[PDB]
Amino acid sequence: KVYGRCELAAAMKRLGLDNYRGYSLGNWVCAAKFESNFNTHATNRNTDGSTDYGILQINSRWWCNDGRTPGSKNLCNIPCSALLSSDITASVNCAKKIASGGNGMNAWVAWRNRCKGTDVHAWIRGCRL
Template sequence: MRSSFLLLLILALVCATLCATNDTVPNSNCGGNCPSGRCTKCHCGTSRSQQDINAWCSKYTGWNQACCRCVVSRESAGNAHAENHNVGGSDDVGLWQINSMNWASCSGGQPPCDPNVNLKCAIKIWGYHKSFKLWSTCGACGCC
């Protein structure tokens, strides 16, 4: 009985260590950064990074500011470490929830968790159609 308890304790410690190092963490909410709880890896860590949405949207004047604020608010609620693991297998990260299929073209293949890099990616993706239509929240914001 005592050896079973020790084995369970060791397994719990191993799990806690893996979660703390941001390695694969099946069904994790990444410290609240992944509200769906479906994240398989905590790309942006397990601590929040709350940002001023208005300040980040205003760093680019080419897009409609109200649309940007609405999209960022609905995508990440201003958390630069926000993440989502999509049903199809891709991952979204950062203020604008940049999809992993875009990481190679805008952030050197790395998750754009840094708000400056995330902004750069968002501007590039927005520029494809000069609109927010590639964001799933554009309809709710009236910005497609």
């Protein structure tokens, strides 16, 4: 499904992402917009044989197992197909684990390039949350 902006913001807020490791809610909404355009079904294959899955484009080299990536570390302990569902719970529980790494949200290069540093509070503007 493709989420509306405020529809996604509210789903993310109810799953504990506002101010998670110092990142306000608009960071996560902006990251999902530039990673997938709010489409739960987005997938992009990577140079190394892994694939990025779902609304936050989580890859199968480190985070989820899709059956076809040799040596997936599956640190989120989830099949990558769980990341394609309308329910974003597994995507945000995994996203919290990758944002716990040393470089935080810089792990998402679309966030690093189009969101980081800007007034990300704009992404939750007008949403009754």
